[PDB]
Amino acid sequence: IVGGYTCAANSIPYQVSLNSGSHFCGGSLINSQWVVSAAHCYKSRIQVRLGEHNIDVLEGNEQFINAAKIITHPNFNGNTLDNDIMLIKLSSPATLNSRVATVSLPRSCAAAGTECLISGWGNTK
Amino acid sequence: GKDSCQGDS
Amino acid sequence: SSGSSYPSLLQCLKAPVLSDSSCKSSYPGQITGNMICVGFLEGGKDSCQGDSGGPVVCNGQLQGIVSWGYGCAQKNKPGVYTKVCNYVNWIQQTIAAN
Numbered sequence: 323i324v325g326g327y328t329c330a331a332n333s334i335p336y337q338v339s340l341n342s343g344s345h346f347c348g349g350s351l352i353n354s355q356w357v358v359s360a361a362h363c364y365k366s367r368i369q370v371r372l373g374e375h376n377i378d379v380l381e382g383n384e385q386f387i388n389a390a391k392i393i394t395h396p397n398f399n400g401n402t403l404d405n406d407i408m409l410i411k412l413s414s415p416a417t418l419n420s421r422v423a424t425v426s427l428p429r430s431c432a433a434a435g436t437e438c439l440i441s442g443w444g445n446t447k
Numbered sequence: 448g449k450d451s452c453q454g455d456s
Numbered sequence: 457s458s459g460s461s462y463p464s465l466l467q468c469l470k471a472p473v474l475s476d477s478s479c480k481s482s483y484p485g486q487i488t489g490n491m492i493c494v495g496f497l498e499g500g501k502d503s504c505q506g507d508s509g510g511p512v513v514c515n516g517q518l519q520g521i522v523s524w525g526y527g528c529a530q531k532n533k534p535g536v537y538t539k540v541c542n543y544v545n546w547i548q549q550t551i552a553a554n
C-alpha cells in the first residue's frame with residue numbers, strides 16, 4: 323500500500339497472508355474453511371496466516387493453516403488478467419473470534435463513488 | 448502494478 | 457512509489473470506486489466487465505506489489521480483489537480489481553463441490 327496508514331492491530335480480521343517461506347500475497351477469509359485471493363498469486367504450496375498484523379513477529383493471535391486445495395478460476399486469462407480470482411480451501415477450519423473473522427460476499431455490485439477499505443503488506447514505496 | 452513481490456521470488 | 461519498502465505492519469487505505477469512464481479511459485481497451493478501478497487519478501494512493509490477492513471492502517462487503525495496474529500510485533493509473541460481485545455464484549458452487 324502506497325500513501326496509506328497503519329491499520330489498528332487486528333482491525334481487519336478477514337485479512338490473511340499467503341506464505342511460502344515469506345509473505346507473497348494477500349487474501350480474504352469469507353468462510354471458516356475458505357479464503358479468496360487472486361489467480362496470479364498461484365503457487366502449489368501455500369500456508370495461510372490468519373490473525374496477522376506484524377508478519378515478522380509472533381504476537382499470539384495467529385493461526386497458521388496450510389492450504390488443502392487451491393482452485394484458480396477456469397477462465398482466468400494470464401494475458402488480460404480477466405477472472406483474476408482464486409479460492410483456497412484450508413486443511414483445517416479456521417477458528418473465528420475477535421482477531422479472525424469472515425467478510426461478507428457482495429449482495430450487489432457497488433455504486434461509483436462508494437468508499438472502500440484496501441489493506442495489505444505490499445510495497446509501500 | 449498492484450501485483451506480488453515478496454515470497455514470489 | 458520510488459523504491460522497495462515492505463512493511464511488517466498491515467497497511468490500510470480508503471479509496472472510492474471509480475466510474476467506468478475513468479477506468480476505461482485510464483486503460484484503453486484493457487478493462488473487461490469483470491474489473492473495476494478503485495483509487496485516485498492524481499496518483500500517490502494505491503495498492504501495490506505484495507497487496508495482490510488482498511481485499512477491497514466497501515460497506516461491509518468484499519467488492520474487489522487486488523489484481524493489477526500499471527506500476528504503483530502513478531497518476532491517471534489507478535489500481536484495477538477483480539469485480540467480485542460477478543463471482544458469487546462461482547464462489548458458492550465451488551465451495552459446495554469441494
Ligand SMILES: [Ca+2]
Nearest residue numbers: 376379380381
Ligand atoms: Ca504476527
